[PDB]
Design a protein around this ligand. Structure first.
Ligand SMILES: Cc1ccc(Cn2cc(C(N)=O)ccc2=O)c(C)c1
Ligand SMILES: Cc1ccc(Cn2cc(C(N)=O)ccc2=O)c(C)c1
Ligand SMILES: Cc1c[n+]2nc(N)[nH]c2nc1OC(C)C
Ligand SMILES: Cc1c[n+]2nc(N)[nH]c2nc1OC(C)C
Lengths: 318, 318
């Protein structure tokens, strides 16, 4: 044991906890200045004693070197797409269909309802709690390695906040740029004669395809996690909402507008509530994602491969 | 001009026309013996005058050499999958959803209704009327080159029956083995101590993965065409049924049980009619494929990429 190893370990733990309070809980226990005081003390100490510098320390989010290009990543589990609806009657038809298709329809049928963010879909792998790899969705099968860019995102933890992290955990979600950051970036680009962005979605996509993480780091990007891919060495909750609460409890940012709704009429109330809230959120949303909350019912329902909306195979019973 | 070139040209035309009457129309104008008399006269003449032998002649369906292996074919247009239903209420929900999702719902909403064959999905390319390539569906993106095996199928024309074939035409359909052939094959395999097949679907799949076309040729395989892929140098009909009638009119086999039905209740009548007919068809069917007949309505509805049945994105209107 040495005093400087202990000071480093204490500063790192303290800083990860404050980043959690600030970014995930939206309830910081100390002022921004106090966080910075400790951050730059950690940074100086690590540079004065480099033998003790760690790759997942809060000070190591930004690579000092711009990349030459992006490698490809074939996802182990494919990143699927989402069906869509444009009316209450259409949503009601989707529910009526699940009601008939299920062996046993429960009373109530609970949905996990979320706002649909307007950003870039990503997959982030944590190995024994440490962020090791991140990829874009791409076509759902293969994407680009954006690990160095994802590491710059302030609300993305480099280490999971648990003493018993899973062996492997892949977090799925959306990277977006809130309104305030987007307006600041466009003002800056105008004041320093550069390319302005038409909308927050374009600003987030453009920021994530930067080969220099030093540029990505200056872009006000945020992650909201909405799912899990690989999950080894853990018993994941049996409802979708509980899995999201579990990600939030181990350091991963999740949207605070997510609710449970029993039946189609409550879900439509959520849709309407979120639709009126649109003007006050501070980031863009295209709609709402409504998911069957029970994982066993999701597994029973399964998925539909790339197919027409204009055809169906009415199969005969045995 | 020579008398033998003219005799060859006349025999070939006559034989293709009789194969059409026999296989597509199910209305042969001559006995089987008359067809064979002309077939073996053509075959002897071609062997006596090999300079005039053509690769698409009715006598050249079977390659004399077994293949070493199967090459891969990436489809130019992906081969999609089909959504499914297991009840009237579920089918009715699928229709209710199309009714709401369409800009303008026509009165009536016409469906092209077909039996769902229980075979192997294939893609067959004709270049200026000549069969040049055939592939299995595989995963919908890449499949295997089974040209030599597809050429052995008696009801598959090596040449389209039209003087103005399209520049390129890809026919999509199912290869299956009728009951009579399946029962004969299993009796033969038992009488010559060999592998028997559990069902016609397995017998068709196993027959198409034979590297020796001489073995495939002895398997009683049939094609029923249900769609079009590539279509260059032609104005395809604007309804699905008319496209199928057009394939039938240029030499391609299509199922005779296909009908047009106006609205969900007529479609369910078709489903019931086909369900009672099951015991009398002479080949296996899993259900019925019900498709929106108007191509512009299909195009408007589009497709759903690989997605869950347990989630939906209810999008906000502009
Ligand atoms: C100078 C400075 C330092 C920190 C922050 C924001 N912030 C605050 C905390 C905190 N309060 O625990 C933790 C992480 C973080 O990123 C800003 C905007 C500016
Ligand atoms: C010996 C023999 C010859 C032909 C056939 C069947 N058949 C008949 C015709 C025909 N009638 O125009 C055309 C093609 C064809 O395949 C069988 C079963 C047996
Ligand atoms: C593509 C996608 C996008 N989103 N967005 C949310 N909120 N959830 C969600 N889930 C998705 O996909 C899973 C349902 C497969
Ligand atoms: C896979 C498939 C299978 N089947 N079978 C029939 N009869 N039609 C049909 N259409 C298909 O696909 C298109 C609708 C894309």
């Amino acid at each position: 044991m040495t005093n400087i190893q202990t000071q480093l370990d204490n500063l790192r733990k303290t800083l990860r906890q404050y980043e959690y309070e600030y970014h995930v809980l939206d309830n910081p226990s100390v002022p921004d200045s106090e966080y910075d005081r400790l951050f730059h003390q950690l940074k100086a100490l690590e540079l004065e004693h480099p033998e003790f510098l760690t790759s997942d320390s809060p000070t190591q989010r930004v690579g000092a070197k711009p990349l030459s290009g992006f490698s490809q990543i074939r996802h182990e589990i494919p990143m699927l797409s989402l069906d869509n609806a444009f009316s209450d009657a259409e949503f009601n038809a989707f529910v009526k269909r699940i009601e008939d298709r299920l062996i046993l329809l429960p009373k109530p049928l609970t949905f996990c309802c979320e706002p649909k963010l307007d950003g870039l879909a990503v997959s982030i792998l944590y190995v024994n709690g440490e962020l090791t790899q991140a990829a874009t969705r791409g076509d759902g099968t293969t994407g680009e390695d954006i690990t160095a860019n994802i590491r710059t995102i302030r609300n993305v933890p480099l280490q999971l906040l648990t003493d018993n992290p899973p062996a492997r955990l892949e977090v799925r979600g959306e990277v977006f740029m809130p309104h305030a950051g987007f307006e600041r970036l466009n003002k800056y680009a105008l004041e320093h004669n550069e390319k302005t962005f038409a909308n927050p979605r374009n600003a987030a996509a453009g920021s994530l395809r930067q080969l220099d993480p030093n540029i990505t780091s200056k872009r006000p990007l945020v992650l909201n996690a909405y799912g899990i891919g690989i999950a080894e060495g853990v018993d994941l909750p049996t409802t979708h909402y509980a899995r999201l609460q579990w990600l939030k409890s181990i350091g991963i940012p999740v949207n605070p507008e997510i609710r449970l709704c029993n039946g189609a009429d409550e879900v439509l109330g959520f849709y309407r509530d979120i639709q009126n809230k649109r003007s006050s959120l501070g980031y863009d949303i295209d709609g709402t994602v409504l998911k069957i909350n029970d994982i066993a019912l999701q597994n029973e329902l399964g998925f539909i491969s790339k197919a027409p909306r204009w055809a169906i195979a009415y199969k005969f019973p045995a």
